[PDB]
Write a protein that binds this DNA or RNA. Structure first.
Lengths: 157, 39, 259, 207
RNA sequence: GAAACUGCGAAUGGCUCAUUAAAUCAGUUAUCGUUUAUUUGAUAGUUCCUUUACUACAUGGUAUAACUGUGGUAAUUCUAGAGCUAAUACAUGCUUAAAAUCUCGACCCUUUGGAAGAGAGUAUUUAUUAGAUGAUGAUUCAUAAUAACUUUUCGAAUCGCAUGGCCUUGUGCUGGCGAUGGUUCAUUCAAAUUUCUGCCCUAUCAACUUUCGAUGGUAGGAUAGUGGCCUACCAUGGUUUCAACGGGUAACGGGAAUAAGGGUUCGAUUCCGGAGAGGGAGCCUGAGAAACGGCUACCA
C-alpha cells in the first residue's frame, strides 16, 4: 500500500508473478526478482527482502554492467535515487614537469537497497544509458567520515 | 533434396544419440572405476 | 559517413601483404567473406604478388574467370579477385595440383606453405562459439566461419579441431589448457609457436595467456589470439620459416652472416 | 524531419551546445500515433485500422490507429482468448488519453468476460452468471464428470473482485503492447496487487 | 544481337569550414539497450488436412512492354489516342496415388531394421510454463514451448547445362550440377551509440542549471530500435575555486621507425576527424542518405 502506490501509478517487477502466485497456495509465493551481476560483487541482503520497485537497479532488473567500473567519493544526496560522485586525480604538465589537481563529476544511479549518506566512497559499474547524464550504477557502498566540506576533501582514492 | 534434408538429419540425430548412450555409458562406467580403488 | 566504404588505398593496405609502396594508389579490397579484412589475403594478391603465377591485373581476370577453374580453397572452387583466404586455410592450384597453407610468418607476413597431398586433406579449425539451437540440437562454429551440426560434446568454446576436408569430418580436437602447443593469429607476437603456460582470466573483460617455446622465450598475449596448433608438444602442421620462432635481430645476423 | 538528436539540448552545465551537422536521416522521428477505440461506432464505421510503416532494416512495422478487439490473458489460469475491449479507464500517463480512449502500452481497460466465462464453465462446471444457479453439472456421477469436481474443489477462491467482474459482464485488464509499434493491443487480466489498487484509483477518482 | 525487360550501383566520392571551443577529436565504452544488405556459412515434414470433381500442375493467371503502328504540338527526358506481344514482373496457385506426412513403440528380427499400433511447420502478436533442464556476473537470456491470434508471413509455376543410369517396355524416374531464389542466425558490413584521458586564456568566470527538464523518477508515446527525447507526472535535483555558471583563443579542427652515443628519418600540403552544396519547406532511394549533387513546391 506504500511501496506500491506511493504517488506513482503502479510498481510491479520484471518477473510478473504476483496475483498468479495465489495458484501455488503452499510453498513460498512472495517472489521478487533475484539476480547477480557477478564480476566479483556480492548481491545486497537488503536488495532481496525489499519491497522497492526500481527498474534501474542492477539486482532487480535486466540492467547489465559492462567494462568500466568506478570508485569515487560522493558529493550530493539529493535527486531521486541518483547521486553525484566526484573523482580526484592529478594531471601532468609536459613543460613544467609537474601536476595540477582536477575533478570529474559523475552521475550515478542508486538502487534503494544500499543506503546513501553524503561524503562516502562509492563503487559504480558501467550500465547502459539511463538518462542524459546517468551511465553508472552503484554496486558497492563504503561509508566514510569527512568532518565538513566535501569540496575541500580531495583524496587520490 | 527437400526429402533428403530430414533424412540426413535423422541419420545424424540417431547417429549422435547412438553415440551418446555409448559415451555416457562409459562416463558413468569410469565413475565406479575411480571410486572403487579409493575404497 | 555517406554509407559503407568500398575501396582501399595502396598506402592503407596491410603490411602483411608485403605490398608495393610505389605500386599504384589502391589495392584489391578483400570481399566480405570467412576472414576479416586485415586478417586475409585476397586471391589477386595470392597469385600476382605471392605465387607470381599471375602478373598484370588482367592476368588474374583470366585465371579466375577462365572456364577451367584453376583455384581451390578448402576443397571448393573460387572465382573472386579478392576472396579472403585466411589463417589455416588450404589452397589448391588446379592446373598443377599445388597445395598451400595460409599462415603468417614469424615476422607477421602472409606465407605460403607447400603441403603434401597428405596434409592437404586436414585443415585446422579453431572454435568460435558453441551453443544449442533449433529443435534440441548442438552447434559449434569455427573462426573459418564454419557452422557445425552435432559435434562431439567434449568440446569447450575455446577449442581447436582437426578437420578432414575430404569427408567433412572431425577428428582429434584439443582445448587450450596449461601444456599445449599454439600459434598466435595476430599481435605484437604473431607467427610464434610455443607451449601454453597458464591462462589467467580476469573477467573484467579481457583474459591473458603466457607461453614458452624452443629457446624457451616468455610470451604474453590475449586468448583471442591463441590458436591451438596442437595438443601436448606435438604440433599438427608443418610450420613456415622452420619452427614458429623468431630471432633477435642479433640472432638473425649470427645465423646468416655469423657475426 | 522530427529528429531526436540529443544535440538541441544543453550539456550538464546548461550551456548551449554547438552543431555542424544538418539533421541526419538516421535520427528519424515518426509522427505520433494516438490509438482510439471502436467500442462506439457512432460515426466510426471501419472497426479497426492498422497502417504499416517501412522501418529501417527494410522491415515493416504495423501501426495501430483505431481498434476494437485485442487479445487478453488471465494470469492465474493461463488462459488467453481474443476478446472485445470495452472502455478505457485511467491511463496513468495522462487522463486525456482516457478522454480520447487512446491506447497506450499500459492503459487499463475493460473486456468481455464471454470467452473466459465460456471457458471457466467448460473446465470447472461453473458459469459465473448470477450466483444462485452457480453450478451446472451432469446427471450421472460415475465417469469423467468426476474431474470438474476435483478442479472445482481446488478451492477456486477466485478473489471476491474477480467474481463480481464476471457477472457484471465487464472485466479489468491492463495492456502490454505498443499499438503504434506492432499494431496489436494485448493485455493481462487484472488481479491481486494491482487490481485492488487500480480499482482504488477508480473508486476515489469518481467519488 | 537490335529493345526492351530488365536487375543491379548511381546513399559510393569528389571538391567544400562556412560554421564550428563543440568531445569535434583522440584514446577510452559493448551495445542487456540499438540497428544491420554485404558475405558466407547453414538452412525449410509438419501449410490439405475442406467431409483428397485436389480437376488436374501434360508446373496458373494475368497482366505489358518492348514492340507495329495513328499522332499531336514554338517546341520537351513531351506526348496523345491504335494495336500488339513477354516475363526471373503482376497475381496466383492442389502440392496424390490413401486414408498426408509428421511425431511411441510393443514386438521380433535381426535386419532391410521389422517395427505394432503409439501418438502429430514458421515471420505477427500476448499469455503463461520452460529454462530443471544451453549460457552469462550476468536473464524474465535463449530456444524453448504453450495456447491462443494475428487482413501476417513463410514457403523456387526458376532457368542452366549435365539425361544416361535406374525399370518400364512408353514409364517412374534419373537429376547431376550449378543459375535463379527463400529462411532465420552470426557472417564479416556496418553503423550506432558508449564509458574510461585530452581545445587557448579567464575568478576581474562564484556560482550554475529546474515550467515541463535542471535533476530523479515514472506513464506513454514516439522513435527501427537506447535515451527528458518528448507525453505527462511529480521528485527537487544536482553542476561547481580541481573555478564550475561561466566567460575570452575564426577553432573547422590534428599516424613510422630506428635508434652505445650519434646515424637518421618516415607515413607523404591534417593518418585523424565533425559541418555546404540559392533561400526556405517538405518530402526521394533504400540493407542502406538528414540524399547536395532525388525530387517537389515555395521563394528568389
Amino acid at each position: 500500500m506504500d511501496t506500491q502506490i506511493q504517488r506513482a501509478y503502479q510498481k510491479q517487477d520484471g518477473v510478473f508473478l504476483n496475483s498468479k502466485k495465489l495458484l501455488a497456495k503452499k510453498t513460498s509465493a512472495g517472489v521478487r526478482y533475484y539476480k547477480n551481476i557477478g564480476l566479483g560483487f556480492k548481491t545486497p541482503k537488503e536488495a532481496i527482502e525489499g519491497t522497492y520497485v526500481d527498474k534501474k537497479c542492477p539486482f532487480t532488473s535486466n540492467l547489465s554492467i559492462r567494462g568500466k567500473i568506478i570508485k569515487g567519493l560522493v558529493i550530493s544526496t539529493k535527486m531521486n535515487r541518483t547521486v553525484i560522485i566526484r573523482r580526484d586525480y592529478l594531471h601532468y604538465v609536459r613543460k613544467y614537469n609537474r601536476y595540477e589537481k582536477r575533478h570529474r563529476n559523475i552521475p550515478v544511479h542508486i538502487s534503494p537497497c544500499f543506503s546513501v549518506k553524503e561524503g562516502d566512497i562509492l563503487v559504480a559499474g558501467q550500465c547502459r544509458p539511463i538518462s542524459k547524464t546517468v551511465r553508472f550504477n552503484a554496486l558497492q557502498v563504503v561509508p566514510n567520515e569527512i568532518i565538513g566540506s566535501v569540496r575541500k576533501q580531495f583524496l587520490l582514492f | 533434396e527437400k526429402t533428403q534434408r530430414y533424412v540426413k538429419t535423422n541419420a545424424a540425430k540417431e547417429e549422435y544419440e547412438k553415440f551418446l548412450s555409448e559415451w555416457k555409458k562409459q562416463r558413468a562406467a569410469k565413475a565406479h572405476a575411480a571410486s572403487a580403488p579409493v575404497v | 559517413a555517406r554509407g559503407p566504404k568500398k575501396h582501399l588505398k595502396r598506402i592503407n593496405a596491410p603490411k602483411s601483404w608485403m605490398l608495393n609502396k610505389l605500386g599504384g594508389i589502391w589495392a584489391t579490397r578483400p570481399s566480405q567473406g570467412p576472414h576479416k579484412l586485415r586478417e586475409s589475403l585476397p586471391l589477386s594478391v595470392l597469385l600476382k604478388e605471392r605465387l607470381n603465377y599471375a602478373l598484370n591485373g588482367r592476368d588474374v581476370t583470366l585465371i579466375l574467370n577462365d572456364k577451367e577453374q584453376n583455384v581451390f580453397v578448402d576443397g571448393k572452387v573460387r572465382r573472386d579477385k579478392g576472396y579472403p583466404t585466411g589463417l589455416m586455410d588450404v589452397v589448391r592450384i588446379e592446373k598443377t595440383d599445388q597445395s598451400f597453407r595460409i599462415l603468417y610468418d614469424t615476422k607477421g607476413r602472409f606465407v605460403l606453405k607447400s603441403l603434401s597431398k597428405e596434409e592437404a586433406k586436414y585443415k585446422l579449425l579453431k572454435v568460435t562459439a558453441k551453443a544449442i539451437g533449433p529443435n534440441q540440437i548442438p552447434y559449434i562454429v569455427t573462426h573459418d566461419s564454419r557452422t557445425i551440426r552435432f559435434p562431439n560434446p567434449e568440446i569447450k568454446i575455446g577449442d581447436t579441431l582437426k578437420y578432414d576436408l575430404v569427408n567433412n569430418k572431425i577428428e582429434n580436437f584439443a582445448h587450450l589448457e596449461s601444456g599445449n602447443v599454439c600459434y598466435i593469429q595476430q599481435g605484437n607476437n604473431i607467427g610464434r609457436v610455443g607451449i601454453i603456460q597458464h591462462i589467467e582470466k580476469h573477467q573484467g573483460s579481457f583474459d591473458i595467456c603466457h607461453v614458452k617455446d624452443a629457446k624457451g622465450n616468455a610470451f604474453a598475449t590475449r586468448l583471442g589470439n591463441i590458436f591451438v596448433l596442437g595438443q601436448g608438444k606435438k604440433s599438427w602442421i608443418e610450420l613456415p620459416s622452420g619452427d614458429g620462432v623468431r630471432e633477435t635481430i642479433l640472432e638473425e645476423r649470427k645465423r646468416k652472416f655469423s657475426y | 524531419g522530427i529528429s531526436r538528436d540529443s544535440k538541441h539540448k544543453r550539456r550538464a552545465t546548461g550551456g548551449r551546445m554547438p552543431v555542424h551537422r544538418k539533421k541526419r536521416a538516421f535520427e528519424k522521428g515518426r509522427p505520433i500515433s494516438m490509438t482510439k477505440l471502436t467500442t462506439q461506432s457512432t460515426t466510426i464505421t471501419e472497426k479497426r485500422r492498422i497502417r504499416p510503416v517501412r522501418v529501417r532494416g527494410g522491415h515493416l512495422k504495423f501501426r495501430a490507429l483505431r481498434l476494437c478487439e485485442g487479445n487478453f490473458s488471465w494470469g492465474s489460469e493461463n488462459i488467453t482468448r481474443k476478446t472485445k475491449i470495452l472502455d478505457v479507464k485511467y491511463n496513468a500517463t495522462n487522463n486525456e488519453l482516457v478522454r480520447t480512449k487512446t491506447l497506450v502500452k499500459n492503459s487499463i481497460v475493460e473486456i468481455d468476460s464471454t470467452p473466459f466465462r465460456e471457458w471457466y464453465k467448460l473446465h470447472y462446471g461453473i458459469d459465473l452468471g448470477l450466483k444462485k444457479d452457480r453450478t451446472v453439472l451432469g446427471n450421472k456421477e460415475k465417469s469423467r464428470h468426476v474431474q470438474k469436481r476435483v478442479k472445482r474443489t481446488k478451492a477456486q477462491a477466485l478473489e471476491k473482485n474477480i467474481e463480481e467482474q464476471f457477472v457484471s459482464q465487464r472485466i479489468l485488464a491492463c495492456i502490454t503492447s505498443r499499438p503504434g509499434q506492432s499494431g496489436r493491443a494485448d493485455g493481462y487480466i487484472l488481479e491481486g496487487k494491482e487490481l485492488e489498487f487500480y480499482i482504488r484509483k477508480l473508486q476515489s477518482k469518481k467519488k
